[PDB]
From a paper:
To confirm the binding mode predicted by the MD simulations, we tried to prepare cryo-EM samples of CalA3 with the amidation product 3 and the hydrolysis product 2, respectively, and the two complex structures were finally obtained. The cryo-EM map of CalA3 with the amidation product was resolved at overall resolution of 3.84 Å and the amidation products were captured in the KS domains of both chain A and B. The benzoxazole moiety may undergo hydrophobic interactions with A336 and L439 and form additional hydrogen bond with R1718 which is at a distance of 3.5 Å. The polyketide chain and the pyrrole ring could also be positioned by hydrophobic interactions contributed by F236 and Q147 respectively. The C–N bond-formed benzoxazole moiety is shifted approximately 3.0 Å and rotated ~51.5° from the non-covalent 3-HAA substrate. Similarly, a motion of this unit combining movement of ~5.8 Å with rotation of 34.9° is also observed compared between the amidation product and SNAC-N1. Together, the visualization of the products in the KS domain verifies the basic binding location in the substrate tunnel analyzed by MD simulations and further reveals the structural flexibility of the polyketide chain. Based on the in vitro reconstitution, mutagenesis analysis, MD simulations and experimentally observed KS domain complex structures with products, we propose that the CalA4 ACP-tethered polyketide chain first enters the substrate tunnel of KS, and the nucleophile C197 attacks the thioester bond to be covalently acylated. H332 then may extract a hydrogen from the 3-HAA amino group, acting as a general base to perform the nucleophilic attack to eventually lead to amide formation or hydrolysis. During the formation of the carbon tetrahedral intermediate, H372, K367, L437, and L439 may perform the 3-HAA positioning function.
Numbering used by the authors:
A (entry chain B): 33 to 456
B (entry chain A): 457 to 658
C (entry chain A): 861 to 961
D (entry chain B): 1670 to 1719
E (entry chain B): 912 to 1467
F (entry chain A): 52 to 253
């Protein structure tokens, strides 16, 4: 139960977002970032992607090798995901106020969510021998946590994690536990997801799983399908007590965490529903918080027609029974504005809630034409945020949760709180 | 362990598999262990450290040489004494038949003494039976006096004959065997009682 | 028939139960091992009944040259009606600067 | 082939054509595997969610 | 920029795929005639070769005809085509899991627009490229065609057929088709012409465009093959004419009006003319050899007796709804089985042959009088009493006729049993077969390979009579249960239990306690042992009893 | 473990020849390379685990070996896999992308192409074990190259100490479905020419 402090967030997201303040403008203006296939990547994709729309990072093919001490051939050989982690990590330190040289020789741990990006398969010819030497380490999943520790001279454990879409919340959970066990002084946690190959778009399009307009209509009655997108993000974590001793800024406080599997049995019992109802109870119990004290939840909300209904039901089975009078649970998802964002789906939600706490406002969920009929809203104890609402500092401590889910069966939850914010 | 000595009581050895061929190869693997470890430890292990699949076999014997001869019979696929085989079906569908004493007077009466003289031997073989049989016999001894203990210890042709001694012993042994099968986790879905045995069926 | 069977009295009940256990009933054998000195011991694991599962058929056991084509001459064509032999090649842009020294 | 060979032959025959040639409305256990039996299977790993 | 691949151009062509039978056009510098090449890998071959003959994959005749039309039209905007003098020698085939190379060429003849198109199939080792078709092409057909013909006027003179029986008639001609060529939807046929409804004929690359003609032309071959008998395949066409890609529905007419040849026409859903065919001949390749084509290897086939150790528990007899008849060589055995069945409430009747005495109240049957009429006139009498029959047990005494008669001849011992049991089996079925009774022929010592001593040759007529029922009266369940010739026979409820677990028919045996079932199974047969063999030189050999055709090959 | 002890105590070495029966197209590029391979990794038993043989073709050999080795680890732990269902058991698997789909010399059949994703995505390996054995605890995959097994044990030990789970299943797999890791180490001359790791020898 030591509270763990977010000292800084760096990110890259769809629609030219380079900071938490850029994401805030895009969500507070009610925009969406989904668009057309990336020009200037080497894609030879035929008619198979005609009409597909997704959340791309424009300019992911560009980098600055000399700043990080790389030769341009080594910089060309690297997986785009490792380059986004390396650029995003320096920005995370610069907002945290740490000099990256003063971080050298530190017991900082690294926990990175990365999945194999396929980048060497773009090649038509066999590559020149100077690329052929560098391709091995530069495209390995394990090397992604090692290059960060080499560039910044970090001495703590370095791990790469994969659990499909939950890879960022799993990476963040292991970092929270490493800090609470006293294994490390700071921990750096996050992930990346960049589509160097078209194959994931084709494999979802061949099955008509993608929404026809490419929008994740979170919890809405339309619920056409899913929406794929790119992204990268890093959070730097320290124990709140050590953060206050050193005087580093605290953006928000992570209070407790959990991960579980939906298992295997007959779907009639709602296995995925039961698993979410246990993961929420575990995350509340870990942080020693109580279910009346949470104000809002940043839900998974992907827009799958039966998938959103199980989540809403699990929230009514959990938070929805213990509300104070006139304090219903506010529900929404950032995945409506920027698309799904795959392995970084939890970072996107934390950036939204950090910015919401700073500005004392919760953003409206885009494309909510009407609540889904696959759940019973008639209690009034949970409601979708269809217009923005104020969320002022006061006598009740502002708290919010995040849920992230995936089809391999991993589910997870976090609870976030305000900074302690003593007067200067 | 301070591990106790015993006479050579029968050991039930259970095997199971998901197709017929895997049962025979499992019998070939097990033959080296039963010919080296003690059979009561091997049988106790297979009852709890392995799952129950659809194809099943049971090997019965008093000692190592007999258990090895049964396992070789399974491995070659040839029938032998103390080997049972089959394919299980998951449905419950089980019922239990109960009889009174006196019907054994109709014909072959000595066999309905020899059955009970065989059943008396179970008092040394299985612990749950001795408890259940005493707990009924010491209760009937309150209504009928001392002879019921002597009769239960020596189940002669009275068990086959229309008599108060016969009917008391028949209720005792049937009540004791029911508590035995329900200790082996059989659970009857119906019961049927022929004649004067209907109290036992009830 | 439960109490009736062969000469050793315990084999009657264990054989009658063994047939029900074989046919489907989930019989608990623990009563046959009570009071006796039973320990746990290690056993063989399950014998899998394996078959081939692979996306590609097994390799032909034939020796061949690793990369025989000459860069400029290339591949010989087999046009059936031809009056004389012909050969054709593509050079890709990395190969072009390799051959044109 | 000293013993156990029984009724034994050497030929090119396709028995699946043989039992479907002419017509035949019920099984014949000399050519065909006797019967099916009671068992069930899982719904597949990801497929219940998609 | 830091990327492995340089950027693709901002505009490019639609890059539509080459037609899968003709592939890439070559670009030889000096060459007059255009040429084309394709390789099909083991994963592609079975996709294009959508027909099987005797199990082996073959290229459909409609696909060869469309391959030539696709090769003909390649560079031209013209929507109307005439192909003439079309010849299609041999069968194109590929053994399962083997590459195929295909090649084609166009030669301009110089005779105005006249182009000659050829198609060629693969070779390796001692083999070389071989011809598998050719045609002469002219564009610009420049003649009118008929006004609208009502499709509903076509079927009026002709009987309709089930599409399931149309494709079964083709299976009895060596031919089976994958789903992309199962294109018929209704058929009408009679006398010397036929008509049919063809659906969206969507072969690979054919859900739109000209490739759909491969299946519409293959439908004309399926129909033209339907009127004859014996295996047959297309050899020639004297004209094919086509205008445009074919509509989503089309109507086919096929006519046998010539001396051994067919003509055909195709109409659209609107009744507009699409294509016509003249001189479609299958007859010059009627009866071409299946033995050089079938996929099956030479193998050793053996009847193996397997134990029913799994699940061999008798089950229950299906109630007393009709009697069981028992016939036996021994009246005491017939009585014993009828008495055994009576204890279970299954009603039974005992019968005996009239050379045995009526010692125990049996019915008696004139068996030995080898005429089905007198045995039928016996079994009919029980139906006039009101007996229903569920089944018949026939039981045979084994070798006991030898010591009972005091003389030995195994050929006489066989021939005496056959006629007696034929008269019984026929004489029974002629009186009851509508009730669907069950037959059990309980031989003794007939089954080989199992224990119980050598099989008695005199039992062989019973196995022959069993196997003769299975393919001639398929509505009836029956079973052979070969008992041990020396052990005591099992309780009759054990027989009828393990018999009534057979749907249809099967062969069973008993030896000691175990039940066994016969299965026919197969293993490889090394003929190279005979290539290594030498016959010993210092010896005589006898070759006996053959005709000329076998004798010449045996001596060779 | 007993086979490894027999090999190690008898003083043997297990490095050998490049595996036939895998669909490899390597020419002179591996001529004379020696390495240690699992023979028969191309063989499996789909019916035991409830898989259709088309999914068994799509699966990465690493997921097949973990799923077999898990059943074996449970059978030696004396825990029935039917008693493990519904448990708070965690799974921590060390795996890396094995290249397996890149063996295909021709485009896949239309059924196997819809199985390839969860057959080969690294993060599917932990989830598939949790699905087969019905385990409700967390299921993560880790990659840190050669040390992936100590990373798996470290996280499993820390999870059990914090009370996250009641049991933890920790380990890894490595099957060279493609030649490319041998080729590149051979091209850079990192391999010993006889193929032996002479661990601390002169």
């Amino acid at each position: 139960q030591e509270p763990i402090a977010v000292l800084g967030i760096g990110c890259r997201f769809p629609g030219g977002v380079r900071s938490p303040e850029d994401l805030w403008d895009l969500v507070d203006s009610g925009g969406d970032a989904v668009g057309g296939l990336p020009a200037g990547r080497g894609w030879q994709a035929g008619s198979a992607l005609d009409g597909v729309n997704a959340g791309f990072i424009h300019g992911v093919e560009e980098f600055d090798p000399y700043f990080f001490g790389l030769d341009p051939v080594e910089a060309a050989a690297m997986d785009p995901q490792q380059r986004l982690l390396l650029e995003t990590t320096w920005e995370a330190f610069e907002r945290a106020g740490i000099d990256p040289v003063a971080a050298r020789g530190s017991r900082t741990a690294v926990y990175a969510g990365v999945q194999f990006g396929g980048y060497p398969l773009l090649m038509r010819e066999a590559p020149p021998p100077q690329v052929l030497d560098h391709l091995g380490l530069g495209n390995s999943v394990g090397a992604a946590s090692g290059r960060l520790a080499y560039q910044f001279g970090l001495l703590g454990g370095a791990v790469t994690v994969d659990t499909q879409c939950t890879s960022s919340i799993v990476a963040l959970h292991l970092a929270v536990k490493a800090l609470r066990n006293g294994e490390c002084a700071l921990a750096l946690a996050g992930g990346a997801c960049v589509m160097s190959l078209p194959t994931v778009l084709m494999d979802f399009h061949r099955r008509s799983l993608l929404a026809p307009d490419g929008r994740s209509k979170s919890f809405a009655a339309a619920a056409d399908g899913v929406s794929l997108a790119e992204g990268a993000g890093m959070l730097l974590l320290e124990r709140l007590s050590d953060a206050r001793r050193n005087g580093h800024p605290v953006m928000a406080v992570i209070r407790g965490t959990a991960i579980n599997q939906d298992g295997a049995t007959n779907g009639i019992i709602s296995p995925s529903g039961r698993a979410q109802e246990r993961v929420i109870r575990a995350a509340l119990a870990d942080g020693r918080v109580t279910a009346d004290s949470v104000d809002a939840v940043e839900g998974h909300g992907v827009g799958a027609t039966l998938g959103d209904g199980v989540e809403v039901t699990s929230l009514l089975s959990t938070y929805g029974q213990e509300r104070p009078a006139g304090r219903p649970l506010l529900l929404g998802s950032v995945k409506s504005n920027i698309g799904h964002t795959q392995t970084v789906g939890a970072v996107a939600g934390i950036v939204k809630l950090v910015m919401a706490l700073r500005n004392e406002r919760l953003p409206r969920t885009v494309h909510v034409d009407g609540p889904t009929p696959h759940a019973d809203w008639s209690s009034g104890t949970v409601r979708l945020l269809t217009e923005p609402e104020p969320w002022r500092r006061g006598e009740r401590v502002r708290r919010a949760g995040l849920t992230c889910l995936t089809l391999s069966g991993t589910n997870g939850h976090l609870i976030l709180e305000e900074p302690p914010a003593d007067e200067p | 362990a301070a591990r106790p000595a015993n006479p050579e009581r029968t050991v039930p050895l259970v095997l199971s598999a998901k197709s017929p061929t895997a049962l025979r190869e499992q019998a070939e693997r097990l033959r080296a262990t039963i010919t080296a470890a003690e059979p009561v430890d091997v049988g106790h292990s297979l009852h709890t450290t392995r799952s129950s699949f659809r194809h099943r076999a049971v090997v019965l014997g008093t000692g190592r040489e007999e258990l090895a001869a049964g396992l070789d019979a399974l491995a070659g696929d040839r029938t032998a004494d103390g080997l049972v085989r089959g394919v299980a079906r998951a449905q419950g569908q089980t019922a239990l038949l109960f009889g009174g004493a006196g019907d054994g007077t109709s014909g072959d009466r000595p066999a309905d003494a020899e059955g009970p003289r065989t059943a008396r031997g179970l008092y040394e073989a299985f612990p749950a039976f001795a408890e259940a049989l005493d707990e009924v016999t010491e209760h009937l001894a309150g209504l009928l006096g001392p002879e019921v203990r002597a009769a239960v210890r020596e189940p002669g042709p009275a068990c086959a004959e229309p008599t108060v001694v016969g009917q008391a012993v028949a209720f005792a042994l049937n009540t004791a065997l029911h508590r035995l099968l329900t200790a082996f986790a059989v659970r009857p879905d119906a019961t049927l009682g022929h004649g004067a045995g209907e109290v036992a069926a009830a | 028939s439960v109490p009736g069977g062969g000469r050793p009295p315990g084999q009657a009940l264990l054989s009658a139960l063994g047939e029900l256990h074989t046919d489907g009933v989930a019989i608990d054998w623990s009563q046959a091992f009570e009071g006796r000195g039973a320990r746990r011991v290690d056993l063989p694991t399950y014998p899998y009944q394996k078959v081939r599962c692979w996306l590609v058929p097994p390799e032909p056991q034939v020796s061949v040259v690793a990369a025989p084509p000459h860069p400029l001459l290339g591949t010989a064509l087999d046009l059936v009606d031809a009056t004389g032999q012909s050969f054709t090649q593509q050079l890709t842009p990395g190969q072009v600067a390799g051959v044109f020294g | 082939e000293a013993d156990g060979s029984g009724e034994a032959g050497l030929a090119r025959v396709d028995w699946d054509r043989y039992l479907t040639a002419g017509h035949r409305p019920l099984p014949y256990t000399v050519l065909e595997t006797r019967a099916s039996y009671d068992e069930e299977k899982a719904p597949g790993f990801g497929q219940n969610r998609m | 920029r830091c990327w492995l691949v340089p950027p693709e151009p901002q505009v490019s062509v639609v890059a539509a795929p080459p037609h899968p039978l003709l592939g890439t056009a070559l670009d030889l510098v000096d060459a007059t005639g255009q040429s084309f090449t394709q390789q099909l890998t083991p994963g592609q071959v079975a996709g294009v070769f959508g027909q099987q003959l005797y199990g082996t994959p073959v290229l459909p005749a409609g696909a060869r005809l469309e391959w030539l039309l696709a090769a003909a039209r390649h560079g031209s905007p013209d929507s109307a085509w005439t192909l003439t003098g079309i010849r299609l020698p041999g069968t194109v085939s590929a053994a399962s899991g083997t590459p195929v190379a295909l090649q084609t060429s166009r030669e301009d003849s110089g005779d105005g627009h006249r182009v000659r198109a050829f198609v060629k199939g693969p070779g390796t080792g001692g083999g070389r490229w071989a011809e598998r078709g050719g045609a002469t092409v002219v564009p610009a057909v420049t003649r009118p065609a008929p006004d609208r013909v009502d499709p509903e006027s076509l079927p009026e003179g002709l009987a309709e057929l089930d599409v399931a029986e149309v494709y079964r008639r083709l299976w009895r001609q060596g031919s089976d088709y994958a789903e992309p060529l199962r294109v018929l939807r209704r058929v009408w046929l009679g006398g010397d012409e036929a008509v049919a409804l063809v659906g969206t004929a969507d072969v690979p690359t054919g859900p739109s465009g000209w490739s759909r003609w491969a299946a519409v032309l293959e439908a004309a071959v399926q129909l033209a093959a339907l009127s004859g008998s014996g295996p047959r395949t297309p050899v020639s066409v004297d004209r094919l004419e086509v205008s445009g890609p074919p509509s989503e529905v089309v109507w086919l007419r096929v006519r046998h009006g010539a001396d051994g040849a067919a003509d055909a026409v195709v109409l659209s859903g609107e009744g507009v003319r699409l294509a016509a065919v003249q001189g479609l001949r299958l007859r010059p390749m009627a009866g071409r050899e299946p033995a050089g084509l079938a996929e099956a290897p030479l193998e050793r086939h053996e009847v193996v007796w397997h134990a029913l150790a799994e699940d061999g528990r008798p089950g229950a007899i299906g109630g007393g709804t009709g009697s069981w008849l028992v016939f036996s060589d021994d009246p005491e055995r017939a009585a014993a089985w009828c008495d055994e069945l009576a204890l279970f409430g299954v009603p039974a009747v005992a019968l005996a042959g009239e050379d045995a005495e009526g010692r125990d109240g049996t019915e008696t049957v004139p068996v030995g009088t080898g005429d089905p009429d007198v045995v039928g006139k016996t079994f009919a009498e029980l139906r006039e009493r009101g007996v229903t029959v569920a089944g018949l047990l026939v039981h045979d005494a084994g070798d006991a006729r030898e010591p009972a008669s005091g003389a030995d001849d195994p050929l006489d011992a066989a021939c005496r049993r056959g006629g007696r049991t034929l008269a019984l089996v026929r004489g029974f079925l002629q009186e009851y077969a509508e009730q669907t009774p069950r037959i059990v022929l309980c031989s003794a010592g007939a089954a080989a390979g199992l224990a119980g001593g050598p099989p008695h040759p005199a039992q062989a007529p019973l196995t022959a009579l069993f196997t003769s029922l299975v393919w001639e009266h398929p509505e009836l369940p029956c079973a052979q249960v070969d008992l041990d010739p020396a052990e005591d026979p099992p309780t009759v409820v054990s027989l009828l239990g393990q018999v009534m677990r057979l749907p249809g028919a099967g062969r069973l045996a008993v030896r000691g306690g175990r039940w066994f079932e016969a299965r026919l199974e197969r293993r490889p047969a090394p003929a190279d042992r005979g290539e290594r063999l030498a016959l010993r030189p210092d010896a005589t050999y006898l070759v006996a009893g053959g005709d000329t055709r076998h004798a010449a090959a045996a001596l060779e």
